[PDB]
C-alpha cells in the first residue's frame, strides 16, 4: 500500500515567528507524529552552524575524544551480508577511539578522495564513522551551547517542561550534547531512544542525510524479526531490510534531513539513518510533560528490567522530583504519575517492614542535595531510599549500593550488610499527600 509509505510530517519555518509559534511544539509532540522534519529551523532562528563546522571544532578541542565505529559502505537503502549472497539485518561494526584531529584529516581526505576519483554484491569498501562525541563541558564548549539556548524552549536541552532537566543530574548523551562526525555512508542503525524518551537532531552540513522511521506502536514486528534472526533488538548492531517491513505490513517514513533541519523523533519511535554527504550532526533527548512520554518511559524502564537492561533514565527518582515540583495539570498524566508513587510507596513500606520484623536496624543515612539516583552495583537495577551497603563498604564510607534482592542472595540474613535510608517515611507520604492535579483552563 501508499499507506506503507506515508509522507513525512514537516514544517516548513521562515522567520522567528514561525519557531515560536505554539502550534510547532504541539505538532512536534503529538503521538500520531511519529517524527517531524522542522526544515529551515537554523535558517529561520539565524543559528551559527559554523560553531559546529569541523574546522572549529578541531580549533576548540583539538585532542577530545571520538568513539570511531567502522562500518561497511552498503548500497543504497540495502544491508548485504559480508559475501554480498543476501540482504540481511545484522551490521556489526568495529569500535576505536580517535581524537577530533584524527579523525578531521580522514573526514576532508575522504573528500578529496572523492573528487580525484570522480576525475578517473559488493566486495564494500571500510568507512569510519565519528560518533558519540561528548559536548557536555561548558567550559570546554561554551559558544557552542549558548547557541543551542536561540531555540525554542521546548526543543532546548535545558527547560522547565524537560522531564530530563527535572531529572536533577546530568545523564551523559541525554541531557548533555552529542556530536556525530560523517562521511557518505556512515550509518546509524535501528534503535528507540533510551528510556523512549523524544530526541532532537540538527544537521550541520554540509552534506545530507537520510532518515528511516517506523512508528512506536510497530516496535513489537521489528522486535520480532530480530528474535527470530538471533539478534538482540536492543544491544545488536541491525539495519531492517525494507522488504521484510513492508511484506509485514510496517509502514516505514523515509526521508533527507539537510543541513539546518531539525529531526524531532517523538517518544518510542524506531529509526536508522545514513549520511548521503560529508556532514556532521548534533543531538540530545528531551521528554515533553505528557502522558504519552511518561507512559512509554515507565514501559521501556520495566522492559529494560526484563533483558537484565540499564535504564539511563531513573524513573524512580525521576517521579518523586516531578511529585516535589512540578504542578501537574493533565488529568492523564497525573493520574499515572499517582499510580507509580503509590507503587512505589507501598513497595518500600512492605519491604521495610520485613526488615523491622526480623530484627534489622534501618540507619538514619540522609542524602546530598544534587545526589545522582542510585543503581544495583550487580544487577543495575535503580535502587530508590533503602540502600544496601556491605559492612567493609559503608566503614570504609564507599557506600556500594545493592538492591534488596542481591544483597539477599550474597548474604542470607542481610550479616553482611547494614540497610542505609535516605528519605524519611514521613517525608515521602507528605509529598505523596500534597502531589494533587493542578487545574488549568486550557486543552
Ligand atoms: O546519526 C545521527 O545523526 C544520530 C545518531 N544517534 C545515535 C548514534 C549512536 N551510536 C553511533 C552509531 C552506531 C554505529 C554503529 C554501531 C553502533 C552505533 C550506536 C552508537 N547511538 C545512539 C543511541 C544509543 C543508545 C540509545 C539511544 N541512541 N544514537
Ligand atoms: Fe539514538
Ligand atoms: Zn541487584
Not at 580522514?106 to 569510519?128: D, H, M, V, W
Not at 534482592?405 to 548474604?411: F, G, L, M, V, Y
Request: proline content about 5%; charged content about 20%; overall charge neutral.
Amino acid at each position: 500500500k501508499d499507506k506503507l509509505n506515508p509522507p513525512t510530517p514537516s514544517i516548513y519555518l521562515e522567520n522567528k515567528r514561525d519557531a515560536f509559534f505554539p502550534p510547532l511544539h504541539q505538532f512536534c509532540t503529538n503521538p500520531k507524529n511519529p517524527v517531524t522534519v522542522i526544515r529551515g529551523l537554523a535558517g529561520a532562528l539565524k543559528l551559527d552552524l559554523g560553531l559546529f563546522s569541523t574546522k572549529t571544532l578541531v580549533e576548540a578541542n583539538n585532542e577530545h575524544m571520538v568513539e570511531v565505529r567502522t562500518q561497511l559502505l552498503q548500497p543504497a537503502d540495502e544491508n548485504w551480508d559480508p559475501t554480498g549472497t543476501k540482504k540481511i539485518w545484522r551490521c556489526e561494526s568495529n569500535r576505536s577511539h580517535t581524537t577530533i584531529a584524527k579523525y578531521a584529516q580522514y573526514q576532508a581526505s575522504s573528500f578529496q578522495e572523492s573528487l580525484r576519483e570522480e576525475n578517473e554484491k559488493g566486495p564494500f569498501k571500510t568507512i569510519k564513522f565519528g560518533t558519540n562525541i561528548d559536548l557536555s563541558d561548558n567550559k570546554k564548549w561554551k559558544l557552542q551551547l549558548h547557541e543551542l539556548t536561540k531555540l525554542p524552549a521546548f526543543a532546548r536541552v535545558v527547560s522547565a517542561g524537560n522531564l530530563l532537566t527535572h531529572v536533577g543530574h546530568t545523564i551523559l548523551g541525554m541531557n548533555t550534547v552529542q556530536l556525530y562526525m560523517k562521511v557518505p555512508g556512515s550509518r546509524t542503525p535501528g534503535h528507540q531512544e533510551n528510556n523512549n524518551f523524544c530526541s532532537v537532531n540538527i544537521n550541520i552540513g554540509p552534506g545530507d542525510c537520510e532518515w528511516f522511521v517506523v512508528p512506536e506502536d510497530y516496535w513489537g514486528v521489528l522486535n520480532d524479526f530480530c528474535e527470530k534472526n538471533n539478534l538482540n533488538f536492543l544491544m545488536s548492531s541491525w539495519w531492517p531490510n525494507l522488504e521484510d517491513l513492508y511484506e509485514a505490513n510496517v509502514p516505514v517514513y523515509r526521508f533527507i534531513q539537510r543541513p539546518g533541519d531539525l529531526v524531532w523523533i517523538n517518544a518510542g519511535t524506531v529509526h536508522w539513518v545514513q549520511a548521503v554527504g560529508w556532514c556532521n550532526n548534533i543531538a540530545w533527548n528531551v521528554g515533553p510533560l505528557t502522558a504519552c512520554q511518561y507512559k512509554l518511559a515507565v514501559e521501556r524502564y520495566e522492559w529494560n528490567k526484563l533483558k537484565s537492561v540499564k535504564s539511563p533514565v531513573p524513573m524512580v527518582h525521576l517521579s518523586w522530583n516531578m511529585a516535589r515540583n512540578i504542578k501537574v495539570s493533565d488529568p492523564k498524566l497525573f493520574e499515572m504519575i499517582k499510580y507509580c508513587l503509590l507503587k512505589i510507596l507501598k513497595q518500600y513500606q512492605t519491604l521495610r517492614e520485613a526488615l523491622v520484623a526480623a530484627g534489622k536496624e534501618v540507619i538514619w543515612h540522609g542524602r546530598t542535595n544534587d545526589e545522582p539516583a542510585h543503581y544495583c552495583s550487580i544487577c543495575e537495577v535503580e535502587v530508590f531510599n533503602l540502600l544496601f551497603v556491605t559492612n567493609e563498604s559503608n566503614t570504609q564510607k564507599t557506600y556500594i549500593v545493592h538492591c534488596h534482592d542481591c544483597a539477599r542472595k550474597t548474604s542470607k540474613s542481610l550479616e553482611n550488610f547494614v540497610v542505609l535510608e535516605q528519605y524519611k517515611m514521613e517525608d515521602l507520604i507528605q509529598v505523596y499527600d500534597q502531589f494533587t492535579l493542578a487545574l488549568s483552563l486550557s486543552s
